[PDB]
């Protein structure tokens, strides 16, 4: 739709990688806090 690629991204797939790394990032910020 937005691009001509035959493997165009989807919003859920992009957000799937977001919350996947969220626990690791959240734990790191605890020591930063």
């Amino acid at each position: 739709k937005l691009t001509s690629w035959k493997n165009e991204l989807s919003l859920q797939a992009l957000k799937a990688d977001l919350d996947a790394a969220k626990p690791s990032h959240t734990a790191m910020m605890i020591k930063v806090k």
Binding site: A21, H25, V32
Partner: protein, 51 residues
């Protein structure tokens, strides 16, 4: 400037006489410069599997 412009293109020494003009459509550059910012570590997430 037009005379030397044509000289650069072809090498022919030609006089330039202003006879007319037209309203063209151009795009004036503005704020064309790089930027650097410091990100809050809480607002950025990196791949844990980066080793």
């Amino acid at each position: 400037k037009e005379s030397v412009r044509f000289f650069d293109e072809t090498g022919q020494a030609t006089y330039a006489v202003q006879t007319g003009t037209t309203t063209t459509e151009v795009e004036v550059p503005l704020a064309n410069h790089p930027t650097v910012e410091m990100l809050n570590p809480e607002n950025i997430i990196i791949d844990p599997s980066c080793q």
